[PDB]
């Protein structure tokens, strides 16, 4: 297992513009296009991203390309964040994949506010962190996915991803 396979499992793959779990326009492998409710805004953003007139639909290769850039961006966002970087570098390789996944899903922003859990993860208090992490809007709105990530942080293995 690796980050790509893991996220590909959590986000799925769709070649036509769709609404995510929060109702925002998205495409490919969880690539948010816009938070605005105007589809046109979304189509414009798509075109801009891909570099061509898509008419709301892309190819697999196009989706995968966006995915690549998006993973990279997330990692790079982690690294540049003063509160995140130190936690991230203290973790082992599997748990770092759990960190990327949360950041990919919620933004460096959302994650940066998990101060307490962050500290627990840094101290290697696995079970305490798992309980803390569950006390969130994130776990309550997307519990199945949150559970998988949390078990990942808790155990340091890919068991939740089987
Ligand atoms: Cl792009
Ligand atoms: Cl879920």
Curated annotation (Swiss-Prot):
Q: What keywords are annotated for this sequence in UniProt?
A: Antimicrobial, Bacteriolytic enzyme, Cytolysis, Glycosidase, Host cell lysis by virus, Host cytoplasm, Hydrolase, Viral release from host cell
Which Gene3D superfamilies does the record match to this protein? 1.10.530.40
Q: Where in the cell is it found?
A: Host cytoplasm
Q: Where is the active site?
A: 11, 20
Q: So what does mutating residue 11 to Q actually do?
A: Complete loss of activity
Provide the disulphide bond pattern.
none
Q: Which residues form the signal peptide?
A: none
Record note on what altering residue 117 to F does: 10-fold decrease in enzymatic activity
- What EC number(s) does the entry state? 3.2.1.17
Single GO biological process annotation from the record: peptidoglycan catabolic process
Q: Which reaction does it catalyse?
A: Hydrolysis of (1->4)-beta-linkages between N-acetylmuramic acid and N-acetyl-D-glucosamine residues in a peptidoglycan and between N-acetyl-D-glucosamine residues in chitodextrins
Q: What is the effect of changing residue 117 to I?
A: 500-fold decrease in enzymatic activity
Q: What is the effect of changing residue 30 to A?
A: Almost complete loss of enzymatic activity
Reported impact of residue 26 to E: Complete loss of activity at neutral pH; covalently bound substrate
**What family does this chain come from, according to its entry?**
Belongs to the glycosyl hydrolase 24 family.
Under PANTHER family, the record lists: T4-TYPE LYSOZYME 1-RELATED (PTHR37406:SF1)
Q: What does this protein do?
A: Endolysin with lysozyme activity that degrades host peptidoglycans and participates with the holin and spanin proteins in the sequential events which lead to the programmed host cell lysis releasing the mature viral particles. Once the holin has permeabilized the host cell membrane, the endolysin can reach the periplasm and break down the peptidoglycan layer.
Q: What is this protein called?
A: Endolysin
Which species does the entry assign this protein to?
Answer: Enterobacteria phage T4
Question: Gene encoding it?
Answer: E
